[PDB]
């Protein structure tokens, strides 16, 4: 709601009871600069140029600890008021215009995610696809829900289609977004 | 379905005209509800709902806590910005422009950064405006964008359609032609 040329999150600090699990990331103008691998105490940069800089992963763990405490205080103080399940909003598109046999990337955009718990997987002609698959962290929105993007690498070929398969608590039955080359 | 409790803390920096105006707003969120906030414009914590009241009262009572949050806009925001100026704000990735049929002509402008971009259609050296409609700017998630700019036409003999694209990354504008 604040108007600026550039907007950073030099700390999107997340903790949740379910799991439990955490996440720590820096965002700049809507993109993920890095996340910290909490289980490994490791900084993973997401924009190559930024590998020249340092950021001590330890302190991200510390931050999550603070959050963990505070969450406990607020669960107590709010009479155990638990999160509301939203319905996620799915879209699948390609990175490049489609050329048969020429390398592409499928993007699965999953929006309005809350709570930050979701399973995002791919389906080729009914079978599932394991390799060529990666995804972003949970990215923040100003309304405090998240979005997350899943990627699949492929050579487009006629009569060869894909489904992006999303599972969320706000969803009665898992959702499938289809993609044909055409 | 399972139950879940979520706590978020966001240390957000807002920059305008380079580094002339810089604003910090630390935000605490309990399940999508911001409850306490430190905004460098204000200068102290403010509950934003009742849940955030004890927190703000306690934190504000600490002279050394406020001392350090007031310095944060310089310690965290202005500092990082210098690093951003040398890298992130220097990222220039050039658009790749492609014309193709859907009676519609789609001009695909893909894989660019930063977001500022101007795409114009021409028909035989004349600009077309009334018959053009863009998709919204699409964010790829990989530090690039893309956008699709469609044009309604009915092709006549000897017609040349031109997609014209302006981007900070280009010294000279890209033009791609298409023929009936």
């Amino acid at each position: 709601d604040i108007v600026a040329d550039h907007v950073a999150s030099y700390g999107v600090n997340l903790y949740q009871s379910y799991g439990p699990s955490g996440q720590y990331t820096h965002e700049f103008d809507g993109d993920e600069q890095f996340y910290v691998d909490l289980g490994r105490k490791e900084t993973v940069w997401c924009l190559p140029v930024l590998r020249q800089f340092r950021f001590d992963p330890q302190f991200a763990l510390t931050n999550i600890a603070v959050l963990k405490h505070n969450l406990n205080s607020l669960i107590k103080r709010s009479n155990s008021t638990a999160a509301t399940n939203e319905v996620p909003e799915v879209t699948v598109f390609s990175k490049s215009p489609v050329t048969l046999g020429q390398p592409n990337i499928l993007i699965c955009l999953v929006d309005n995610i809350f709570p930050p718990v979701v399973n995002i997987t791919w389906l080729s002609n009914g079978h599932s696809v394991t390799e060529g698959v990666s995804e972003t962290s949970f990215l923040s929105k100003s309304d405090h829900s998240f979005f997350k993007i899943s990627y699949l690498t492929l050579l487009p070929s006629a009569e060869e289609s894909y489904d992006c398969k999303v599972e969320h608590w706000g969803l009665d039955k898992p959702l499938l977004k289809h993609w044909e080359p055409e | 379905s399972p139950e879940d409790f979520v706590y978020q803390f966001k240390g957000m920096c807002y920059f305008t005209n380079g580094t002339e105006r810089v604003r910090l707003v630390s935000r605490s969120i309990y399940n999508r509800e911001e409850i306490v906030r430190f905004d460098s414009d204000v200068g102290e914590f403010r509950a934003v709902t009742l849940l955030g009241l004890p927190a703000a009262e306690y934190w504000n009572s600490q002279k050394d806590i406020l001392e350090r949050k007031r310095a944060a806009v310089d310690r965290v925001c202005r500092h990082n910005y210098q690093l951003e100026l040398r890298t992130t704000l220097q990222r220039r990735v050039e658009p790749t422009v492609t014309i193709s049929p859907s009676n519609l002509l789609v001009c695909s402008v893909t894989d660019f950064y930063p977001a500022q971009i101007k795409v114009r259609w021409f028909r035989n050296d004349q600009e077309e405006t009334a018959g053009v409609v863009s998709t919204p700017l699409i964010r790829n998630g990989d530090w690039t964008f893309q956008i699709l700019v469609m044009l309604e036409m009915t092709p006549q003999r000897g017609d040349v359609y031109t997609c014209h694209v302006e981007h900070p990354s280009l010294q000279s504008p890209i033009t791609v032609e298409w023929r009936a």
């Binding site: 030099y10 931050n63 959050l67 405490h69 | 934190w59 990082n80």
Partner: peptide
């Protein structure tokens, strides 16, 4: 001499 990305730090409630 390697430059560092800094972060805002959260506070403990009482």
């Amino acid at each position: 001499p390697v430059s560092k990305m800094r972060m805002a730090t959260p506070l403990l409630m009482q």
